[PDB]
Symmetry: D3
Subunit: 274 residues, 6 copies
Amino acid sequence: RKRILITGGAGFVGSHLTDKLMMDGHEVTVVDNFFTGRKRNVEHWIGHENFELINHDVVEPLYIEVDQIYHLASPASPMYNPIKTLKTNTIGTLNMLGLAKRVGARLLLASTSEVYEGKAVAETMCYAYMKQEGVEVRVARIFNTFGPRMHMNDGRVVSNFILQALQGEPLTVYGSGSQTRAFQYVSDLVNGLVALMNSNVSSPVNLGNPEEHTILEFAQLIKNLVGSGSEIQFLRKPDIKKAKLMLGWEPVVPLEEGLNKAIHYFRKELEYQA
Amino acid sequence: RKRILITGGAGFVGSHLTDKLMMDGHEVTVVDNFFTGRKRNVEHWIGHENFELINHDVVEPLYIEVDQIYHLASPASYNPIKTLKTNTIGTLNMLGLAKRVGARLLLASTSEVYEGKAVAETMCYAYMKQEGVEVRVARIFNTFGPRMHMNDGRVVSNFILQALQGEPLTVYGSGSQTRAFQYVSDLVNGLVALMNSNVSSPVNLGNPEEHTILEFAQLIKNLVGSGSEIQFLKPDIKKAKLMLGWEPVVPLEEGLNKAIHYFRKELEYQA
Amino acid sequence: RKRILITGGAGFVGSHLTDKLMMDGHEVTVVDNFFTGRKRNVEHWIGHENFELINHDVVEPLYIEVDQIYHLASPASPYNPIKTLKTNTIGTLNMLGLAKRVGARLLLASTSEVYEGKAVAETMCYAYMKQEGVEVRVARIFNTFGPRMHMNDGRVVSNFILQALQGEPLTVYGSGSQTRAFQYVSDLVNGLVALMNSNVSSPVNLGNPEEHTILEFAQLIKNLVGSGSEIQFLRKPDIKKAKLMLGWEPVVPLEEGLNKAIHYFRKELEYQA
Amino acid sequence: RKRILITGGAGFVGSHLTDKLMMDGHEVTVVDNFFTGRKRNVEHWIGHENFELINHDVVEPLYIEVDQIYHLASPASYNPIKTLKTNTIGTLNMLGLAKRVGARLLLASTSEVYEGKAVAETMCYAYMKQEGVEVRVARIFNTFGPRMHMNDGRVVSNFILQALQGEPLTVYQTRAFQYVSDLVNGLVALMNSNVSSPVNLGNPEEHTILEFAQLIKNLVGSGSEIQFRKPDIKKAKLMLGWEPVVPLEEGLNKAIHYFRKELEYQA
Amino acid sequence: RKRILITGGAGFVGSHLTDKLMMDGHEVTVVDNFFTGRKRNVEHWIGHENFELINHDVVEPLYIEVDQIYHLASPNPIKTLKTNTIGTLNMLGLAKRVGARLLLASTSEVYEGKAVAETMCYAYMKQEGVEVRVARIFNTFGPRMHMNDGRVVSNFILQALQGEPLTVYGSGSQTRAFQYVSDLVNGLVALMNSNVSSPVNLGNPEEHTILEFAQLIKNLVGSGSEIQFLRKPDIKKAKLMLGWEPVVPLEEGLNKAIHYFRKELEYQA
Amino acid sequence: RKRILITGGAGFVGSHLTDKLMMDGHEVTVVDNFFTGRKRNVEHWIGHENFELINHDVVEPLYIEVDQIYHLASPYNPIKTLKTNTIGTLNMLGLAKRVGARLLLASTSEVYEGKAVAETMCYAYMKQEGVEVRVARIFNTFGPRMHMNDGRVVSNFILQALQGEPLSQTRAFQYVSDLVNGLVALMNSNVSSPVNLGNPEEHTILEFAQLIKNLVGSGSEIRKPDIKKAKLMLGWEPVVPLEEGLNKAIHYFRKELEYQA
Ligand SMILES: NC(=O)c1ccc[n+]([C@@H]2O[C@H](COP(=O)([O-])OP(=O)(O)OC[C@H]3O[C@@H](n4cnc5c(N)ncnc54)[C@H](O)[C@@H]3O)[C@@H](O)[C@H]2O)c1
Ligand SMILES: NC(=O)c1ccc[n+]([C@@H]2O[C@H](COP(=O)([O-])OP(=O)(O)OC[C@H]3O[C@@H](n4cnc5c(N)ncnc54)[C@H](O)[C@@H]3O)[C@@H](O)[C@H]2O)c1
Ligand SMILES: NC(=O)c1ccc[n+]([C@@H]2O[C@H](COP(=O)([O-])OP(=O)(O)OC[C@H]3O[C@@H](n4cnc5c(N)ncnc54)[C@H](O)[C@@H]3O)[C@@H](O)[C@H]2O)c1
Ligand SMILES: NC(=O)c1ccc[n+]([C@@H]2O[C@H](COP(=O)([O-])OP(=O)(O)OC[C@H]3O[C@@H](n4cnc5c(N)ncnc54)[C@H](O)[C@@H]3O)[C@@H](O)[C@H]2O)c1
Ligand SMILES: NC(=O)c1ccc[n+]([C@@H]2O[C@H](COP(=O)([O-])OP(=O)(O)OC[C@H]3O[C@@H](n4cnc5c(N)ncnc54)[C@H](O)[C@@H]3O)[C@@H](O)[C@H]2O)c1
Ligand SMILES: NC(=O)c1ccc[n+]([C@@H]2O[C@H](COP(=O)([O-])OP(=O)(O)OC[C@H]3O[C@@H](n4cnc5c(N)ncnc54)[C@H](O)[C@@H]3O)[C@@H](O)[C@H]2O)c1
Ligand SMILES: O=C(O)[C@H]1O[C@H](OP(=O)(O)OP(=O)(O)OC[C@H]2O[C@@H](n3ccc(=O)[nH]c3=O)[C@H](O)[C@@H]2O)[C@H](O)[C@@H](O)[C@@H]1O
Ligand SMILES: O=C(O)[C@H]1O[C@H](OP(=O)(O)OP(=O)(O)OC[C@H]2O[C@@H](n3ccc(=O)[nH]c3=O)[C@H](O)[C@@H]2O)[C@H](O)[C@@H](O)[C@@H]1O
Ligand SMILES: O=C(O)[C@H]1O[C@H](OP(=O)(O)OP(=O)(O)OC[C@H]2O[C@@H](n3ccc(=O)[nH]c3=O)[C@H](O)[C@@H]2O)[C@H](O)[C@@H](O)[C@@H]1O
Ligand SMILES: O=C(O)[C@H]1O[C@H](OP(=O)(O)OP(=O)(O)OC[C@H]2O[C@@H](n3ccc(=O)[nH]c3=O)[C@H](O)[C@@H]2O)[C@H](O)[C@@H](O)[C@@H]1O
């Protein structure tokens, strides 16, 4: 049982990771500046003995004593404040590697499938601390994820179809809707992160869901699961064999169950905003 | 139309203050470290042209350019030291800021001076006398309304929750003691009147209308419409009436209704 | 035998605290910024092996290794309101941080006037005791006189002694039937020491419960000075807790303490001629 | 006539840039920590009125007053962390400086973007968009000439070294090389242009490695036995009126003269 | 009428300098860490409108706005070297930022840190255009001087007041020249407000023998003390460039200094 | 075998000391800001196991771990010079204090500015902080890597001689290897008081000029140190014959000029 720092812990992925590691009996310390995350995402844990929330910006040196660091502190966007994003990914990662070096923590970087800005150099910084300072690093290349606590108003397709469907709005299908998307449910991703953190694989690893559907196939499925009278209008798949083999990991959450849950969250939010 | 800093802006009173000053077409900057306040209390304004949210702890020096400062950054109740540092070091910093850029500063003091909020007042008058800073001091009494802290064990909060949760209403004593409660919009109006007046001495902002603890328990039980059993076990604003022409105008029932709506919509969200 | 930090150690009360503890063979270190204190009040120890003066301001972090801190640093007034407050608040936090880090016991020299910055300083100590386990001691001190007191504060005692020595009229406001309790300094100093070495963390009044009337003080001093000064018209301390918890109580009789304060005021007035 | 900061000014390209801007009577200030550059590369200008050398690390904040900044502070290749810090933090600092004093900033980026120089480009455009800083971005391709690194194991360096020292020339295809003064011309044109988007600065003319070793073999004149992405600059030609004018032979002669005067000094 | 900083202002010479410049209606600000000086040397001025006392160590950067600086701040051998070097740099840094003229109270002892201090002054002058004046001060005496330093004037006065024997090393034929403090302060002001940027000696050319001194002091005090046995300054440059010279007759100065030592000795009862 | 810090290591004397201490298998760390020194003076050692070059200004605090410090960091820019000699020197004594290192001050025969107080600062640390210190009072040295363009007499005659330029008093010159041997001898002894390290052997301004004229082979037209304390306390003395020393210095002046055509 380990003392774990999660930067970006109050965000979409960070909060679900937090829930998981607290249930597993670890001392989870969350660092977040609430630039894109929410205190509500982790409030359930405030006061519990093995939890602590620190309102800190990773661009500022952080001194704490831990065995692991899940480095997830990076804002997402539809880029809202490009300079702050670039500062966070670079200076932010250097500080968390500095911290990892001083106290001997293993650090996992939440990288992105978008490497195929600031997250490219971030991977490189990890590998430079590994090679040069003996820091243990793990690098996850994360693909499209969805679920409760995701950003609803970013203009991604899952968020759009879910909002439009709940609001009786027409579901806007760009193109012929034959193009394809692959979505992983957040608990699968969390399972992947933990597995990669505790493996011995220091090279990059893709965590995504290889199963694709057509954008339209998605729109019809969301329409049904919501049960709205909404109308439909018109206007790089992940390879996870390295995770299947090295980590014995793969997404197991059926798509319908993942969407049901995301929908329950979008519904709860929309009524709350009344 | 003025550039206004509201420290503690993301809290209960601070957020309602924010709404009103944005509706009036001012440039509002909210500073808050979210120790007791919430981003949700101000999210409606993020992105808006005349608005900005800064995640800053007032215990740290803050450099910004403004004409007014509503200094409300003080936690309610936990971490007694952080509280004392905030009321003292925080207040010194905001006055330093008021001094350097010539802003008028209003301190959200409390009827509890009749810790750290006493010295804060003293610190304000010392900057006025010694450095010519313009200061205003509001002595705030019991307030309630949407976005208040539900789980503090305050009486309005307990009764609304118990009534909403079908639970019995706990009346300590015979419930004949009395309380005076002010609705949040009334307080916000009062604060603005005090900020823009010429009165630098302390001014009470509260509601003189008193009710019995039991009348409150009874009134809330009815406005909620709960089958809850009831079990058993004053501000003087005449200086505000005359110097500011201010007074609470929200009838108790209307205020309680809005607050009950908030507690409910909240309880549903946490299900 | 201890290592003791006295902040404000060059002031009226500080210097006599320093005298006693020094004579007791402790490692006394004085910290003072001479705002209202005087190098002369300690100079007698400069050079001696177990003493050290450090020109420091308590609003600035201080790092040092001690067993105890007698925190007496707060300027006397009749002056610079902002500085007094930063000192009572920021200054006290630092010495409380200092006591936390090195495990020192901190005695706060508080005041009877709590019945500014002094009130929240008490709170600041009890906050650190609860939250951080710092051992704190809180003394509520009452009117104090003696050598090295401030002479031109226009307190009643300094005024009567001043006017008396100068042959001036003694100015008694109203009928002088109002009353004051005064405590001699060595009594206060013994009380602080007893307090700092007891197990009482709750506040302990230190004062002289023996009241007198303003007219009587003026009369008595007049008699002790033997001047041709004409008199012209224009909350008691409860120390039972200290008697019971510390076996302490003022034992220096008024006139003896008055004589001594007269001898100091005289020596000064001559020096300044 | 402008006050100009050149980071990495004491380096291979930085120094040739330095020469030309001085000759033009500007107040050139060079910043360099001598991690890969050499004081010798700029010593001639020390003392001249319009010149100054500051031994400073761009990873540390720099407060100075200029109209322009040529940001060339990037090590060539060793110490991966210092390199990444230099490229990211160093660059942020220079944009901050550019932001505070209203200086125009040109980034000496690399053809290798087709590390830390990618994000460096991005940081620049974010300051353009967010803080209104004027930025210019040059994508530099293989350059050669006097003051180049002789012992990097690049091919031009190898063949010259091997040839002068009678060594066999190790030919393991085509490469396109640009002479350093042409690049300098480009840098200056782009800096004073209005093109804020990226511009390639390189020489499109290719030869085979064997063709090179032979040209070098002859230009040096040794009996050494030989053993065993082209740049598109049409955008510079059109927006800057720039193009390489130094013939490959003339450029190699100059580089060979440098390597020859260096080996002798190390005898 | 000028805003004047006096480092070491709370010391022997600094306070007399402080006095005279306050008498002249200037805004005098004193900086002192009370390492060798006393709040008493200047308390007479605390509260006055044109005065301020700042408890500051010149080894720490100091930011203030002034037209002049009399740098007299000089006293544990290391603190001494730091004060003379770093202290002086800081005061020149300040002089540069605010365009103040700076006077260095150097010493006749250059014929440590006061040698290099001079070099630093001329270096800021030459390189940054800071205006500097440099006084080479010879032996000074008077009220508020250090009594227990073991100087000869100090010893003889103390021994004489206390009936102790007056300890004269050698046959007492060696010679010393002593300047009274009020002369020196005038000397300092004349040099500050001249255009002479080169060094200037401020001392009393008048010499006497040590034995001659002990006898003069012995008479002016009137004690039954027994006498036991066990570089003259050239101010011609000051006479001509500043029209300055000591005017306090030796007797009058010694009288005043003796009064101070006496008043102090009773006070210490 | 000792971990040695050498400030000014990239300078004329600092580098030869650097060479000689490396050949001896010590862990040499050079601190230099390249104000008057050259990276080239030490590049030969870059990469080697017992060596490190650090670009640091001694006026800024330096934190490192060593057994010894040869403080030669001293350079035109008078303020910077005085700052380097005073604050620079305080730091190296501060550092020597924190890590218990022995410190050597490369002082100069000119104490007979900023190098006077340096001596003064060192002894204050010895006395007050028990820091062990050594002080060498160095006279005029010559050799490869010297500042050629200083206007010293040997330098002037060599430049004039090496360039066909036209060229009764005594000047005493010490060769660099001699100085270096002397410095190490002073470092690893127990004499903490000042020691003159120079060459007592004198020649005439006129002899020198005649000697240089011939050693170059051009058509060119034409306070003595007391080291008895060093001879005795360190058993040290200059051994490099004047001609051989001049030859090496001349060879340097030549290689540089050609490098500069
Ligand atoms: N969501 C995806 O599909 C996806 C895809 C690729 C990569 N990722 C990576 O996973 C991580 C989490 O993504 P997410 O969707 O949960 O994003 P998110 O916006 O929900 O969470 C990021 C969290 O980091 C915090 N943060 C941002 N800047 C910070 C700073 N300077 N200091 C401290 N905290 C800061 C934010 O407030 C937020 O709570 C990110 O690093 C992201 O790049 C996610
Ligand atoms: N609500 C009442 O009944 C009442 C009564 C008397 C006085 N007041 C005063 O009115 C003001 C508003 O109080 P409230 O009840 O809305 O409390 P609140 O907790 O809702 O608001 C306090 C806000 O200030 C912020 N804050 C706390 N510490 C801070 C720090 N160090 N730096 C920056 N921000 C910080 C908190 O996050 C919070 O958002 C307070 O000053 C309070 O003392 C309120
Ligand atoms: N004398 C009384 O009758 C009386 C009554 C009640 C309380 N007290 C308390 O006793 C304590 C001492 O009082 P006193 O009569 O000795 O007053 P004093 O003024 O003689 O002593 C205060 C000392 O603290 C020093 N000081 C002030 N600010 C400082 C700072 N920021 N840093 C360092 N030193 C600083 C002053 O120079 C002075 O020497 C005080 O805390 C006071 O409030 C005294
Ligand atoms: N050589 C090429 O053909 C080529 C190709 C692509 C890009 N570039 C770019 O051109 C620029 C110069 O290239 P070059 O061959 O002249 O490189 P170089 O190594 O000759 O020069 C880089 C200079 O920057 C200095 N420097 C490095 N880190 C520093 C720091 N932290 N602070 C201050 N100074 C620092 C070095 O000491 C050196 O003099 C670089 O940005 C490089 O990326 C060159
Ligand atoms: N008295 C003489 O005969 C004589 C002779 C030659 C030169 N001087 C020079 O005149 C100047 C004043 O002499 P003095 O007799 O008044 O000496 P002094 O010790 O009486 O005065 C020096 C003052 O400077 C202060 N000081 C010392 N170090 C300080 C620091 N780091 N920061 C701030 N203040 C500090 C001391 O507290 C003291 O008040 C000195 O520079 C001295 O070198 C005096
Ligand atoms: N060579 C001589 O004739 C001679 C004679 C007597 C004394 N000395 C002394 O020996 C020492 C070295 O002499 P040199 O002839 O080798 O000089 P040099 O100029 O060749 O070397 C001095 C070195 O110190 C470095 N330096 C300067 N300021 C610095 C700072 N602030 N931080 C770090 N490094 C800095 C310079 O870059 C230079 O490399 C000097 O202290 C000098 O005074 C030399
Ligand atoms: O630039 C360099 O040459 C050096 O950079 C780093 O050293 P440094 O960057 O000084 O310190 P790090 O240990 O890398 O720390 C990096 C950053 O993390 C921050 N940090 C450090 C420790 C910590 O607990 N928390 C924390 O936020 C510090 O602010 C620091 O700026 C490397 O560790 C060295 O190998 C490298 O040679
Ligand atoms: O101690 C003293 O004697 C002096 O203390 C203060 O001066 P100071 O605290 O230095 O500066 P202030 O402007 O009073 O600032 C108070 C605090 O506010 C902070 N501050 C200042 C300015 C600002 O814009 N923002 C800000 O957060 C500073 O960190 C500072 O700690 C008083 O203003 C002076 O009257 C007083 O004489
Ligand atoms: O604000 C908070 O939440 C924190 O406030 C304090 O921590 P902090 O004020 O950071 O540090 P302290 O150790 O209490 O020191 C207070 C001050 O004393 C000063 N200090 C500390 C140690 C020392 O030896 N000397 C000294 O002057 C420091 O400058 C510091 O500003 C409490 O100790 C923490 O429990 C609390 O979590
Ligand atoms: O090192 C250098 O090359 C430069 O050193 C100095 O510049 P610097 O010492 O950085 O700044 P100064 O203006 O000389 O200030 C010296 C000291 O004075 C102090 N200072 C400065 C300004 C002030 O208002 N008050 C004050 O006490 C500062 O703490 C600083 O450490 C010289 O001014 C330059 O001519 C020189 O070229």
